[PDB]
Coordinates of all heavy atoms in Angstrom, one line a residue:
Chain X
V315 N 64.2 83.6 93.1 CA 65.1 82.5 93.5 C 65.1 81.4 92.5 O 64.0 80.9 92.2 CB 64.8 82.0 94.9 CG1 65.7 80.9 95.3 CG2 64.7 83.2 95.9
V316 N 66.2 81.1 91.9 CA 66.3 80.1 90.9 C 66.6 78.7 91.5 O 66.1 77.7 90.9 CB 67.3 80.4 89.8 CG1 67.1 81.8 89.3 CG2 68.7 80.2 90.3
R317 N 67.2 78.6 92.6 CA 67.5 77.3 93.2 C 67.6 77.5 94.7 O 68.4 78.3 95.2 CB 68.8 76.7 92.7 CG 68.9 75.2 92.9 CD 70.1 74.6 92.3 NE 70.9 73.7 93.2 CZ 71.6 72.7 92.9 NH1 71.7 72.2 91.6 NH2 72.3 72.0 93.8
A318 N 66.8 76.7 95.5 CA 66.9 76.6 96.9 C 67.6 75.2 97.3 O 67.3 74.2 96.7 CB 65.5 76.7 97.6
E319 N 68.5 75.3 98.3 CA 69.3 74.1 98.6 C 69.6 74.2 100.1 O 70.3 75.2 100.5 CB 70.5 74.1 97.8 CG 71.4 72.9 98.0 CD 72.7 72.9 97.1 OE1 72.8 73.9 96.3 OE2 73.5 72.0 97.3
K320 N 69.1 73.3 100.9 CA 69.4 73.3 102.3 C 70.8 72.7 102.6 O 71.1 71.7 102.0 CB 68.3 72.5 103.1 CG 68.2 72.9 104.6 CD 67.2 72.1 105.3 CE 67.7 71.1 106.3 NZ 66.7 70.6 107.2
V321 N 71.5 73.4 103.5 CA 72.9 73.0 103.7 C 73.1 73.1 105.2 O 72.5 73.9 106.0 CB 73.9 73.9 103.0 CG1 73.8 73.6 101.5 CG2 73.6 75.4 103.2
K322 N 74.1 72.3 105.7 CA 74.4 72.3 107.1 C 75.8 72.9 107.3 O 76.8 72.4 106.7 CB 74.4 70.9 107.7 CG 74.6 70.8 109.2 CD 73.4 70.1 109.8 CE 73.8 69.6 111.2 NZ 72.7 69.8 112.2
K323 N 75.9 74.0 108.0 CA 77.1 74.7 108.3 C 77.3 74.9 109.8 O 76.5 74.6 110.6 CB 77.1 76.1 107.5 CG 76.4 76.0 106.2 CD 76.5 77.4 105.4 CE 78.0 77.7 105.2 NZ 78.5 77.0 104.0
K324 N 78.5 75.5 110.1 CA 78.8 75.8 111.5 C 78.7 77.4 111.6 O 79.3 78.1 110.8 CB 80.2 75.3 111.9 CG 80.3 73.8 111.9 CD 81.8 73.4 112.2 CE 82.7 73.9 111.1 NZ 83.6 72.8 110.7
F325 N 78.0 77.8 112.6 CA 77.9 79.2 112.9 C 78.5 79.5 114.3 O 77.9 79.1 115.3 CB 76.5 79.8 112.9 CG 76.4 81.3 112.9 CD1 76.9 82.0 111.9 CD2 75.8 81.9 114.0 CE1 76.8 83.4 111.9 CE2 75.7 83.3 114.0 CZ 76.2 84.0 113.0
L326 N 79.6 80.1 114.4 CA 80.4 80.2 115.6 C 80.6 78.8 116.2 O 80.5 78.6 117.4 CB 79.8 81.2 116.6 CG 79.4 82.6 116.1 CD1 78.9 83.4 117.3 CD2 80.6 83.3 115.5
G327 N 81.0 77.9 115.3 CA 81.3 76.5 115.7 C 80.1 75.6 116.0 O 80.3 74.4 116.0
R328 N 78.9 76.2 116.1 CA 77.7 75.3 116.3 C 77.1 75.0 114.9 O 76.9 75.8 114.1 CB 76.7 76.1 117.1 CG 77.2 77.0 118.1 CD 76.9 76.7 119.5 NE 77.6 77.5 120.5 CZ 77.2 78.7 121.0 NH1 76.0 79.1 120.7 NH2 78.0 79.4 121.8
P329 N 76.9 73.7 114.7 CA 76.2 73.3 113.5 C 74.9 74.1 113.3 O 74.1 74.3 114.3 CB 75.9 71.8 113.7 CG 76.3 71.6 115.2 CD 77.5 72.5 115.3
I330 N 74.6 74.5 112.1 CA 73.5 75.3 111.7 C 72.9 74.8 110.4 O 73.6 74.2 109.6 CB 73.8 76.8 111.6 CG1 72.6 77.7 111.9 CG2 74.4 77.1 110.2 CD1 72.9 79.2 111.9
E331 N 71.6 74.9 110.2 CA 70.9 74.5 109.0 C 70.3 75.7 108.4 O 69.4 76.4 108.9 CB 69.8 73.4 109.3 CG 70.4 72.0 109.6 CD 69.4 70.9 109.5 OE1 68.2 71.2 109.7 OE2 69.7 69.8 109.1
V332 N 70.8 76.1 107.2 CA 70.4 77.2 106.4 C 70.1 76.8 105.0 O 70.6 75.8 104.5 CB 71.4 78.4 106.5 CG1 71.4 79.0 107.9 CG2 72.8 77.9 106.1
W333 N 69.3 77.6 104.3 CA 68.9 77.4 102.9 C 69.8 78.3 102.1 O 69.8 79.5 102.2 CB 67.5 77.7 102.7 CG 66.5 76.8 103.4 CD1 66.1 76.8 104.7 CD2 66.0 75.6 102.8 NE1 65.3 75.8 104.9 CE2 65.2 75.0 103.8 CE3 66.1 75.0 101.6 CZ2 64.5 73.8 103.6 CZ3 65.4 73.8 101.4 CH2 64.6 73.2 102.4
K334 N 70.6 77.7 101.2 CA 71.3 78.4 100.2 C 70.4 78.8 99.1 O 69.8 77.9 98.4 CB 72.5 77.5 99.6 CG 73.6 78.2 98.9 CD 74.7 77.3 98.6 CE 75.9 78.1 98.0 NZ 76.8 77.3 97.2
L335 N 70.2 80.1 98.9 CA 69.3 80.6 97.9 C 70.1 81.2 96.7 O 70.8 82.2 96.9 CB 68.4 81.7 98.5 CG 67.6 81.2 99.8 CD1 66.6 82.3 100.2 CD2 66.8 79.9 99.5
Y336 N 69.9 80.6 95.5 CA 70.6 81.0 94.3 C 69.8 82.0 93.5 O 68.5 81.8 93.5 CB 71.0 79.8 93.5 CG 72.0 78.8 94.1 CD1 71.5 77.7 94.8 CD2 73.3 79.0 94.0 CE1 72.4 76.8 95.3 CE2 74.2 78.1 94.5 CZ 73.8 77.0 95.2 OH 74.7 76.1 95.7
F337 N 70.4 82.9 92.8 CA 69.8 83.8 91.9 C 70.4 83.7 90.5 O 71.4 83.1 90.4 CB 69.9 85.2 92.4 CG 69.5 85.4 93.9 CD1 70.5 85.6 94.8 CD2 68.2 85.3 94.3 CE1 70.2 85.7 96.2 CE2 67.9 85.4 95.6 CZ 68.9 85.6 96.6
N338 N 69.7 84.2 89.5 CA 70.1 84.1 88.2 C 71.3 85.0 87.9 O 72.2 84.6 87.2 CB 69.0 84.3 87.2 CG 69.4 84.3 85.7 OD1 69.9 83.4 85.2 ND2 69.2 85.5 85.1
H339 N 71.2 86.2 88.4 CA 72.2 87.3 88.1 C 72.6 87.9 89.4 O 71.8 88.1 90.3 CB 71.6 88.3 87.1 CG 72.6 89.1 86.4 ND1 73.1 90.3 86.8 CD2 73.2 88.8 85.2 CE1 74.0 90.7 85.9 NE2 74.1 89.9 84.9
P340 N 73.9 88.3 89.5 CA 74.3 89.0 90.7 C 73.6 90.4 90.9 O 73.5 90.8 92.0 CB 75.8 89.2 90.5 CG 76.1 88.9 89.1 CD 75.0 88.0 88.6
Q341 N 73.1 91.0 89.8 CA 72.6 92.3 89.9 C 71.2 92.3 90.6 O 70.8 93.4 91.2 CB 72.5 93.0 88.6 CG 73.7 93.7 88.2 CD 73.8 95.1 88.9 OE1 73.4 96.1 88.3 NE2 74.4 95.1 90.1
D342 N 70.4 91.3 90.5 CA 69.1 91.3 91.1 C 69.2 90.7 92.6 O 68.1 90.6 93.2 CB 68.1 90.5 90.3 CG 68.5 89.0 90.0 OD1 69.3 88.5 90.8 OD2 68.1 88.5 88.9
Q343 N 70.4 90.4 93.1 CA 70.5 90.0 94.5 C 70.2 91.1 95.4 O 69.3 90.9 96.3 CB 71.9 89.4 94.7 CG 72.0 88.6 95.9 CD 73.4 88.5 96.5 OE1 73.7 89.1 97.5 NE2 74.2 87.6 95.9
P344 N 70.7 92.4 95.3 CA 70.4 93.4 96.2 C 68.9 93.8 96.2 O 68.4 94.4 97.2 CB 71.3 94.6 95.8 CG 72.4 94.0 95.0 CD 71.7 92.8 94.3
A345 N 68.2 93.5 95.1 CA 66.8 93.9 95.0 C 65.9 92.9 95.7 O 64.8 93.3 96.2 CB 66.4 94.0 93.5
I346 N 66.3 91.7 95.8 CA 65.4 90.6 96.4 C 65.8 90.2 97.8 O 65.0 89.5 98.5 CB 65.3 89.4 95.4 CG1 64.1 88.6 95.7 CG2 66.6 88.6 95.4 CD1 63.6 87.7 94.6
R347 N 67.0 90.5 98.2 CA 67.5 90.0 99.5 C 66.7 90.7 100.7 O 66.5 90.0 101.7 CB 69.0 90.2 99.7 CG 69.4 91.7 99.9 CD 70.9 91.8 99.8 NE 71.4 93.2 100.1 CZ 72.4 93.7 99.4 NH1 73.1 93.1 98.6 NH2 72.7 95.0 99.7
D348 N 66.4 92.0 100.5 CA 65.6 92.6 101.6 C 64.2 92.0 101.7 O 63.6 91.9 102.8 CB 65.5 94.1 101.3 CG 66.9 94.8 101.5 OD1 67.5 94.4 102.5 OD2 67.2 95.6 100.7
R349 N 63.6 91.6 100.5 CA 62.3 91.0 100.6 C 62.3 89.6 101.1 O 61.4 89.1 101.8 CB 61.6 91.1 99.2 CG 60.8 92.3 99.2 CD 60.6 92.8 97.7 NE 59.3 92.4 97.2 CZ 59.0 92.2 96.0 NH1 59.8 92.6 95.0 NH2 57.8 91.7 95.6
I350 N 63.4 88.9 100.9 CA 63.6 87.5 101.5 C 63.8 87.7 103.0 O 63.1 86.9 103.8 CB 64.8 86.8 100.9 CG1 64.5 86.4 99.4 CG2 65.2 85.6 101.7 CD1 65.8 86.2 98.6
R351 N 64.5 88.7 103.4 CA 64.7 88.9 104.9 C 63.3 89.3 105.5 O 63.0 88.9 106.6 CB 65.7 90.0 105.1 CG 66.2 90.2 106.6 CD 67.7 90.4 106.6 NE 68.1 91.8 106.6 CZ 68.4 92.5 105.4 NH1 68.1 92.0 104.3 NH2 69.0 93.7 105.5
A352 N 62.6 90.1 104.8 CA 61.3 90.6 105.3 C 60.3 89.5 105.5 O 59.2 89.7 106.2 CB 60.7 91.7 104.4
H353 N 60.5 88.3 104.9 CA 59.6 87.2 105.1 C 59.6 86.8 106.6 O 60.6 86.6 107.2 CB 60.0 86.0 104.3 CG 59.0 84.9 104.1 ND1 58.4 84.2 105.2 CD2 58.4 84.4 103.0 CE1 57.5 83.4 104.7 NE2 57.5 83.5 103.4
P354 N 58.4 86.7 107.2 CA 58.4 86.4 108.7 C 58.9 85.0 109.0 O 59.3 84.8 110.2 CB 56.9 86.5 109.0 CG 56.2 86.2 107.7 CD 57.1 86.8 106.7
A355 N 59.0 84.1 108.1 CA 59.6 82.8 108.3 C 61.1 82.8 108.2 O 61.8 81.8 108.5 CB 59.0 81.8 107.3
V356 N 61.7 83.9 107.8 CA 63.1 84.1 107.6 C 63.7 84.8 108.9 O 63.3 86.0 109.1 CB 63.5 84.8 106.3 CG1 65.0 85.0 106.3 CG2 63.1 83.9 105.1
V357 N 64.5 84.2 109.7 CA 65.1 84.8 110.8 C 66.1 85.8 110.4 O 66.1 87.0 110.9 CB 65.7 83.7 111.8 CG1 65.9 84.3 113.1 CG2 64.8 82.5 111.9
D358 N 67.0 85.5 109.5 CA 68.0 86.4 109.0 C 68.6 85.8 107.7 O 68.4 84.6 107.4 CB 69.1 86.7 110.0 CG 69.7 88.0 109.9 OD1 69.4 88.7 108.9 OD2 70.6 88.3 110.7
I359 N 69.4 86.6 107.0 CA 70.1 86.2 105.8 C 71.6 86.4 106.1 O 72.0 87.1 107.1 CB 69.7 86.9 104.5 CG1 69.8 88.4 104.7 CG2 68.2 86.4 104.1 CD1 69.7 89.2 103.4
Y360 N 72.4 85.8 105.2 CA 73.8 85.8 105.5 C 74.6 85.9 104.1 O 74.1 85.4 103.1 CB 74.3 84.6 106.2 CG 73.5 84.4 107.6 CD1 72.4 83.7 107.6 CD2 74.1 84.9 108.7 CE1 71.7 83.5 108.8 CE2 73.4 84.8 109.9 CZ 72.2 84.1 110.0 OH 71.6 83.9 111.2
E361 N 75.8 86.4 104.2 CA 76.7 86.4 103.1 C 76.1 87.0 101.8 O 76.1 86.5 100.7 CB 77.3 85.0 102.8 CG 77.9 84.4 104.0 CD 78.8 83.2 103.7 OE1 79.1 82.9 102.5 OE2 79.2 82.5 104.7
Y362 N 75.4 88.2 102.0 CA 74.7 88.8 101.0 C 75.4 90.0 100.4 O 74.8 90.7 99.4 CB 73.3 89.2 101.5 CG 73.3 90.0 102.8 CD1 73.6 91.4 102.8 CD2 73.2 89.4 104.0 CE1 73.6 92.1 104.0 CE2 73.2 90.1 105.2 CZ 73.5 91.4 105.2 OH 73.5 92.1 106.4
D363 N 76.5 90.4 100.9 CA 77.2 91.6 100.5 C 78.6 91.3 100.0 O 79.5 92.1 100.1 CB 77.3 92.6 101.6 CG 77.8 92.1 102.9 OD1 78.1 90.8 102.9 OD2 78.0 92.8 103.9

Side-chain angles (χ1 to χ4, degrees):
Chain X
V315 180
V316 310
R317 199 176 129 149
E319 182 180 358
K320 201 177 109 170
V321 291
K322 189 122 161 142
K323 322 185 60 82
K324 293 176 299 226
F325 191 66
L326 308 184
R328 329 241 172 91
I330 207 176
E331 283 197 331
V332 287
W333 293 86
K334 197 171 188 204
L335 304 186
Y336 296 93
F337 313 104
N338 173 62
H339 203 266
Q341 270 283 268
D342 55 30
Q343 201 204 101
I346 199 161
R347 73 188 181 216
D348 291 316
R349 267 155 99 204
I350 291 161
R351 193 137 92 271
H353 198 299
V356 174
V357 197
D358 208 358
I359 56 166
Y360 304 90
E361 305 194 11
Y362 51 82
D363 52 355

